[PDB]
């Protein structure tokens, strides 16, 4: 039949763009 | 369709029968949505069944026939061949309809001046508009502070970084 | 022919053109039906060594092309 | 004839081989398959710079 | 089967040597044996597969298992 | 405003297609030559394409790529460097890479 199964691309092997998101977010960091 | 702004040919055919020859490029352009399947030409081409014939003979009958025919203009054996849609309604005076263009196995429509240049200026031309277009509505105007588009004692205060920069860089 | 004579040309180059032809194309043929012949005869034999079980088969293969 | 004979015969075989790659059939790329799940490619992601 | 199938297909082809040879113009039906061989030797390799794309989906799955123990294990 | 003339089947089938197309990296730069991305109801009918992304959906689509160019599209900065030659080639060249 069909039966969930469950995997996570366990095959396939930054604060930079995280830093820009936050820019983004939150708009200056100094605050 | 427009037939002047595209390019065509089939590197399918021409390797099909080979070589690129002064009758093969009349035969491709057979194929080229260039000719037309009423030209005189393909009139000729019905009339006679698998038979030798000669290339004199195609021009000599070319003039004694009467209507759309499309002959060489210019040839060169090793990459472009030169052809026109001339239209003879009697021998020996022809009225050319339009001039077609071959080139490294390619057939081109190759226009006419008017159209060239005419679109040329028309690119310009809508350069001109866009740019126009958006730089007036951005300026501001005053009347008393001018035109705008949207402290001595702080460029001290840079004076005083740049120079320590300098400072730290010939270090 | 007709052509030929329309523009000058000699009937006679025509049927040496063709006689030409015909031993042309004779030996042409004849020798690609030969190299057939030993393509197929080398891989018979390969099969044999390879496969001797059905040998039998193959000499039968080659029985059943010629005439009674 | 006879020659017309050995190419359409070699064409006939070409034409078979033709159909015969439409034919098989390849086991499943199911690494793809599991990415595209969760609908992205990350294989031409992670890869390309 | 197979095997079979394979060494009929050789024999076939021995034939259609010969029938080229001898009379070319009698390869169609020659040919057509040919390609009927070769396609069932395919329509049957192919109902092998559905199996081993199944087992290795599982060889996946145990190696998604394997790192996943191990992480626990390490964690 | 003209009257919508659209079909219910037929445009699924074109959508599929046309989330195909987008997997094409030279037609994301011909279209960002043409300025499509200067529309913003192209960028609406983008997220439409997300519904591709559905796994009955997505059962359908026959190159991955898509996917992925359309998540890389969100980017408008990306968008005006596929209007670039060089860096279309170095997409193109990407994939032709990874295949």
């Known amino acids: 039949s069909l039966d969930p199964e469950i995997i996570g691309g366990q095959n396939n092997f930054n604060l930079q763009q995280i830093f820009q998101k936050i820019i983004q977010e939150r708009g200056p960091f100094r605050d | ?171 | 022919v007709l052509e030929y004579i329309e523009q000058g040309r000699n009937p006679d180059v025509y049927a040496r053109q063709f006689s030409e032809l015909v031993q042309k194309d004779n030996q042409y043929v004849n020798g690609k039906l030969y190299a057939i012949e030993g393509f197929q005869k080398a891989f018979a034999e390969e099969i044999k060594q390879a496969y001797p079980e059905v040998s039998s088969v193959v000499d039968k293969i080659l029985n059943e092309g010629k005439v009674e | 004839g006879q020659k017309f004979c050995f190419q359409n015969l070699v064409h006939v075989l070409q034409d078979i081989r033709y159909q015969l790659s439409f034919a098989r059939l390849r086991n499943s790329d199911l690494v793809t398959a599991l990415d595209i799940l969760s609908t992205g490619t990350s294989l031409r992601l992670a890869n390309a710079p | 089967e197979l095997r079979f199938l394979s060494r009929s297909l050789m024999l076939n082809f021995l034939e259609l040597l010969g029938i080229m040879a001898k009379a070319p113009e009698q390869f169609p039906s020659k040919v057509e044996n040919i390609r009927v061989l070769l396609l069932n030797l395919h329509h049957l390799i192919n109902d092998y597969r559905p199996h081993q794309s199944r087992e290795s989906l599982i060889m996946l799955l145990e190696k998604q298992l394997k790192h996943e123990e191990s992480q626990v294990e390490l964690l | 405003l003209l009257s919508k003339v659209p079909d219910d089947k037929s445009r699924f089938e074109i959508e599929l297609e046309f989330v195909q197309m987008l997997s094409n990296p030279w037609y994301l730069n011909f279209l960002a030559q043409h300025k499509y991305f200067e529309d913003e109801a192209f960028l609406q009918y983008l997220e439409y394409m997300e519904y591709w992304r559905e796994p009955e959906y997505v059962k359908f689509i026959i190159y991955p790529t898509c996917l992925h160019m359309l998540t890389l599209l969100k980017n408008p900065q990306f968008r005006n460097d596929i209007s670039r030659a060089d860096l279309s080639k170095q997409v193109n060249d990407e994939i032709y890479y990874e295949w």
């Open chain 2, 1 to 171: 369709v427009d037939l002047t702004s595209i390019q065509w040919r089939m590197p399918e055919w021409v390797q099909s029968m080979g070589g690129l020859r002064t009758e093969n490029v009349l035969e491709y352009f057979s194929q080229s949505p260039f000719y037309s399947h009423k030209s005189n030409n393909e009139m000729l081409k019905m009339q006679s069944q698998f038979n030798a014939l000669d290339l004199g003979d195609l021009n000599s009958q070319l003039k004694r026939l009467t209507g759309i025919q499309f002959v060489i203009i210019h040839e060169r054996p090793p990459f472009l061949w030169v052809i026109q849609k001339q239209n003879r309604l009697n021998e020996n005076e022809v009225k050319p309809l339009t001039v077609y263009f071959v080139c490294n196995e390619n057939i081109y429509m190759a226009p006419n001046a008017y159209t060239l240049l005419a679109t040329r200026m028309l690119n310009a031309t809508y350069c001109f508009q866009k740019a126009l277009t958006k730089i007036e509505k951005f300026p501001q105007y005053n009347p008393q502070e001018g035109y705008t588009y949207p402290s001595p004692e702080d460029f001290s205060v840079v004076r005083a970084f740049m120079q320590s920069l300098h400072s730290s860089k010939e270090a």
